[PDB]
Amino acid sequence: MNVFNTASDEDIKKGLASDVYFERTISAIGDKCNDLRVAMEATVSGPLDTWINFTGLDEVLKLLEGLDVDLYAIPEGTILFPRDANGLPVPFIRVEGRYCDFGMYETAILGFICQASGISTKASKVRLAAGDSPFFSFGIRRMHPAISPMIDRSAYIGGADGVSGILGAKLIDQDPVGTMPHALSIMLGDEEAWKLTLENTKNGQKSVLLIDTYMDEKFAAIKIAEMFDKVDYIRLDTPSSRRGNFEALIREVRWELALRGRSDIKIMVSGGLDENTVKKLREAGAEAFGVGTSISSAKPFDFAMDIVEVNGKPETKRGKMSGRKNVLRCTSCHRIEVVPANVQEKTCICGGSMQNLLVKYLSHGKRTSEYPRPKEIRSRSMKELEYFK
Amino acid sequence: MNVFNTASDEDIKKGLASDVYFERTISAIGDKCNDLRVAMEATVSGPLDTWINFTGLDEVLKLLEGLDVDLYAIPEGTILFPRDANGLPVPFIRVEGRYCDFGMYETAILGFICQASGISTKASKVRLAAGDSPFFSFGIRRMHPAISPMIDRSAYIGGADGVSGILGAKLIDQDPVGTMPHALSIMLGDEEAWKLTLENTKNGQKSVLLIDTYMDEKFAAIKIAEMFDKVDYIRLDTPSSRRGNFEALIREVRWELALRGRSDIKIMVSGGLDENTVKKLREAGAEAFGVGTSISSAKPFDFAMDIVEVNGKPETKRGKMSGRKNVLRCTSCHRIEVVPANVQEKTCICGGSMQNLLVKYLSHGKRTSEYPRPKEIRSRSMKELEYFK
Amino acid sequence: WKLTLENTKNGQKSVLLIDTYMDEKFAAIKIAEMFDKVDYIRLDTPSSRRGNFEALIREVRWELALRGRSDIKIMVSGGLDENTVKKLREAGAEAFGVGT
Amino acid sequence: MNVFNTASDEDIKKGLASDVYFERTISAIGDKCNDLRVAMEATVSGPLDTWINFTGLDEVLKLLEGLDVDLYAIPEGTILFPRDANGLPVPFIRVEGRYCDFGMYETAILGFICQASGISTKASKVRLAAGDSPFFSFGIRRMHPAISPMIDRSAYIGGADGVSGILGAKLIDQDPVGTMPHALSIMLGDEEAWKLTLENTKNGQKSVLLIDTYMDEKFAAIKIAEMFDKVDYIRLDTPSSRRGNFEALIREVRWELALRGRSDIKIMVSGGLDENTVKKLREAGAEAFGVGTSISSAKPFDFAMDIVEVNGKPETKRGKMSGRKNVLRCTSCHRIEVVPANVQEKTCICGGSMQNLLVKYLSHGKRTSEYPRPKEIRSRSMKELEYFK
Numbered sequence A, B, D: 001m002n003v004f005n006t007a008s009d010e011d012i013k014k015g016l017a018s019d020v021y022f023e024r025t026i027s028a029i030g031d032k033c034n035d036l037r038v039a040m041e042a043t044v045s046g047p048l049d050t051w052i053n054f055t056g057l058d059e060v061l062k063l064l065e066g067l068d069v070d071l072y073a074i075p076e077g078t079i080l081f082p083r084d085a086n087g088l089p090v091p092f093i094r095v096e097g098r099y100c101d102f103g104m105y106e107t108a109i110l111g112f113i114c115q116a117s118g119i120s121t122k123a124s125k126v127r128l129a130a131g132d133s134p135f136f137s138f139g140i141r142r143m144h145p146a147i148s149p150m151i152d153r154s155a156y157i158g159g160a161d162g163v164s165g166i167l168g169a170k171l172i173d174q175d176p177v178g179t180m181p182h183a184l185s186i187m188l189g190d191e192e193a194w195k196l197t198l199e200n201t202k203n204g205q206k207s208v209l210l211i212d213t214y215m216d217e218k219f220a221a222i223k224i225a226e227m228f229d230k231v232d233y234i235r236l237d238t239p240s241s242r243r244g245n246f247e248a249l250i251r252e253v254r255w256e257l258a259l260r261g262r263s264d265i266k267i268m269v270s271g272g273l274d275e276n277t278v279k280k281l282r283e284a285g286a287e288a289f290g291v292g293t294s295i296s297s298a299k300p301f302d303f304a305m306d307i308v309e310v311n312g313k314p315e316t317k318r319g320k321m322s323g324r325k326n327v328l329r330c331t332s333c334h335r336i337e338v339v340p341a342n343v344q345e346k347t348c349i350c351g352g353s354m355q356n357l358l359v360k361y362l363s364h365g366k367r368t369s370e371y372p373r374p375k376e377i378r379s380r381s382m383k384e385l386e387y388f389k
Numbered sequence C: 001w002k003l004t005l006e007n008t009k010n011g012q013k014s015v016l017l018i019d020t021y022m023d024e025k026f027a028a029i030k031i032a033e034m035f036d037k038v039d040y041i042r043l044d045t046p047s048s049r050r051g052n053f054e055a056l057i058r059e060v061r062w063e064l065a066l067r068g069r070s071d072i073k074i075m076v077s078g079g080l081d082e083n084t085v086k087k088l089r090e091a092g093a094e095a096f097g098v099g100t
Ligand SMILES: [Zn+2]
Pocket: A329, A330, A331, A332, A333, A348, A349, A350, A351, A352, A353, A354
């Protein structure tokens, strides 16, 4: 094993990152393993009072590729409610094959979609609040570094314009984002910190000065206004105990800057931000946002996975619906209706037609298509998020 | 890089799992790097209305070992409030050395203690509720598999008697825990599933039959009572929609079993359990608990890290307290009072004496002691948790 | 501040208003290492700057004691209540200005 | 000084009714006084969740007249929100001159507009609730008699049709209003009290009989109906402990009167009335209201006054906006936008144009116009109140 308390890719692929009951159960089944073919579907037990931005499927395919199983799933970036128009639980993925062949991967499969999805969904909420103002994922520091890249990836797919993590940036194929830290002003002083920042930032990227280290934001803004000229943004990461009314403070700063003819200096805010916070601060004048904890710590959706068919016959347990299923969605209004797997489409009068969403990504362990890059996926989410305001 | 969206140990050690601003800032500082020695302390900005079971330090030492820095920290498993008796923020770790030498590790350092601590703290809350009844960590499936081991480790340290993850079990040096899955009853039927379970479980471990797959828990209990004899536990993972009043259902089942002289069959419950849920169900008769999501998804504590001294002089930013500090605790009542680093201890009249808690774990990159194994750490937490009811 | 100190002699205590321009914390440090005959520091901190007045006061008090100037007492004013007074005093405030 | 605990006009004009820090501070400044010219603006720190009916300016002019200062203000009776369309604090008055010349009057200046404004604003709320039914200011008895006239003046300006105070009436140039007191019925009995009341009231004024002294309002109404004929109103000042459901009691009384063909007798109510109470009771049939305590004790708006410019240069403190300013309002929709003092007006597309509201009332201590009488001011408020329902 490795140094830190993590499971390597090798380990998760070997089925070591799972609840032991699986291998012990498969072991007990013995030769019956050769006669037990199943179909399992993942549904959200979790929060049912919100829509979801599905994410984490890419990880699932990396794990099941090579095994003799068929896999169906809703594409990443698809946004929808966990229950259909008639309150039926929506299946996001279906796996078919010999139970003993992939049963041990249930733990990891759920793990890949539960946490990631909560993150991308929360980022989409923030996306709606930020409107045409950009926001960036800044929270990987609140979670274990090992999952640093997946967090920034889902945050990006969910709507984030940029990301701060190096590996996350590499993974989404974008340049990392970053502004000067408080540490710089503490070590060299504001004036030198700002000078150094401006000198180490040339066109192709915007200038950003952190101003809350020592002074009152208002006077820091006036000082910067009459000291430099090539400053695109002023960033306020104002301490909680100093944040009596962040909105009024921002209006005050904006007025003082415009008074000296420097309304060209835009305002960026960060620190304990929410979809709620973002909306208010932007209505107050903030034009850029740094969002961390609320997104990186987003509660995971509670996905469950269970057998829905055995050797071709529909079969489940109490609290679950049997049979393999398809997920139909109206091409015009996005209404959804889950149906038995033998119903490919349904005619409607509303607008357009109802087509299957649960699509096959793996056939006998082989990919059925080239997987989309992160940019393409978030591009899809942004279109999808349109249907939700 | 690796297959999944994770950062390898190699990567986190190279400073790749971090916000880019650090390396870009260190790069900008240049030769000044040789003249900037600092001391940074991690304090909880986070939830201040609860105590905390500190955890994740082991990971921090693995990363800084080998670098020329001194490290002080509160031992893992120590339980205390984020603010002292006088409302002062408590520092959990202090790092000393050339800023440019470890500045990039801030992201990972916070990551190691934020999420882990939330998990161990939540497990301790559950520990208090479970009393003398055992509970096990079953939630790694709700989070990304890569951090599967650290979750079970912190859950164990926080009070969990057992863990389900293979790697988590290996890491704490305990046998994984596991009961038959619903899948087994769906594939082979209850009778065969139970028979197989009993046959594949011999003394050294207790027998546990999952009974909610097909029947009403009450009649499943009666049937099992008059069908087998060597059954130690009956487990109810009763579906949410079937859980009208779990407490009354459990009393009903317990009565029916005692009526047939089988009160020897103990009851275990699992599924959407909390410290609150555990308490109620145990008061109703449950003697074993499976706890997952509430613990594995525990919100991370919001730790922040900032320079508190530069080249020997106290220096911080707005919202932080300058100077290196010690954390004194009364040996008898556990009252805490943070003080300047030059105050090793203080005399008191209450009970005993006040001694420093923030102890040195690294001296010039070398360990100052042999690190405790997980069992020893949770053994410490259990004693510590005594001071909180 | 200089004018205030010069126009205040024993029989009355010295009080410096510190929230006009700086962050209360750094105003406190500056005053600590600039004057000596200062009995009180007064914070009439603006509403929009008052995120957590209690924590701000503890922070200021710590920084002053760190430089051996815990002799400087703290006075607060602005939107105070019986409720506010109690909390702030438990946080270290030793004098209060109560109006509205 | 005088007998009662009050400051005479002489005293307030001498700067004796103020916080001593002003004179002691001005004294300390010495000759610097000759080189310190400033501009101070009064803004509402106070309630920001309600509009305001500005009042008390007349008092301010009486005090500053004769001093070498310029004064700008929003006219009395203007109704608007304390923050503009963009959340900027609105200045209601601006004073220009040598600081030491008027600095001591800050206490009195705020005093004149804080309490008066709360009173006129509350009266306007009542005005909206009373609709086309008249209401009168009856509460000077709840406040110190010395400020008896200003209270009735602001209540009138805010919407009151009449006032009970002698000096208040004289000041607004209206006849005081008054009905027989309970004392009269207690001393002479209801019958004699009513007879005396009717005999001492001739056309030019309406007859009003107080009926709740001894009987149940319902039977008092029947008795009066069949005893007198020239009775215009019946007044119910019903005791709190007897007021189970004032609305139903009023309907009951109104029915009984109409049954005997005396629906000509109108109903007036008084006692613990609010904008809320007035509305309900009028919907129940009350056509006249006596309103005291809720208006006379109206909480004062929290106005603050601070330097916004020094020797021609914009300059303020944290939490305030620097520079002299104008208050522009759309002539058609009343939208408001505060701007720098060098922006007299702004073009808009909505409706009409945006013109300055903050007008000069004093130039070098001389009035720039003849001040409006109370009737003219409330006439303005009533038009202004139209924009608020
Ligand atoms: Zn359709």
